[PDB]
Design a protein around this ligand. Sequence first.
Ligand SMILES: Cc1c(Cl)ccc2sc(N)nc12
Ligand SMILES: Cc1c(Cl)ccc2sc(N)nc12
Lengths: 149, 149
Amino acid sequence: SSPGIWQLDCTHLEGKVILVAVHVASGYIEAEVIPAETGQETAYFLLKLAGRWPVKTVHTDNGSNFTSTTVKAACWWAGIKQEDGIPYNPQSQGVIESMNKELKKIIGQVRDQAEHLKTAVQMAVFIHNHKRKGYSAGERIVDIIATDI
Amino acid sequence: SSPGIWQLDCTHLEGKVILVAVHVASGYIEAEVIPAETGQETAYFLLKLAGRWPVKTVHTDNGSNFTSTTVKAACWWAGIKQEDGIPYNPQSQGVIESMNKELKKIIGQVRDQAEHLKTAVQMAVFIHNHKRKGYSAGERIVDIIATDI
Ligand SMILES: Cc1c(Cl)ccc2sc(N)nc12
Ligand SMILES: Cc1c(Cl)ccc2sc(N)nc12
């Protein structure tokens, strides 16, 4: 069920880790800066995400998070089906890679407005989700999920 | 425009601060634990919120946040109209008070499942937004905003 499918994406900048969840059908994202991509951090991020949107399936970003007992506990708690993130579809790699490049571009454009990286990352989330491409990612996720209800 | 109206709410537990944003028309919430309710914390919370939902108007929770230059900078950045939160409607007090009591109840019911308060708070956000009252708050916010688009 495509309205409920999200993909985890971990990228790096300034020696820090940016964890992104992408709503695959819309391109809508949520993101956070973390010190390191641990099971505990990923678990907490997923718990927050699933309290905010109806997350049914998550394609995890790597095998360590797929294996993590803490990540599995969070997915159990929150009613999330944890899946691998193997791009059986090859264009899935390229779409994420492109989004990572785009996000890093936006972060660069705002970086001086922000004292801390986490502020710049949330500015980038804002700009990404509002950008009209015609509809915005925010508009698309709401339409997709409303129709599903 | 009722689809875009949110209310800030600050409550306390275990000597810590829980900052809540309520989508007034739906009862949907986002929340975070912070060390203290500063302008900087409130500003960052609003930036995150407005990157995730179309926040047009925020009724701030007190006069210090209403006055804060950092909160005003975030509202300017994110396109949010900052208003006072004076309950011209007297039932507004009681609805927030009730939600605070309900949230604290849920936190108590999950508290032992969570090592840290922040995990319990996000479990409570999850339970609150999914609770069927008949529709859930999550269902209502999406319907309200989809109709508005
Ligand atoms: C900007 C935006 C977000 Cl971030 C999320 C949902 C919606 S619905 C709409 N018209 N705009 C949005
Ligand atoms: C559980 C939930 C949330 Cl937290 C937010 C939006 C929606 S729409 C739907 N059917 N469920 C939800």
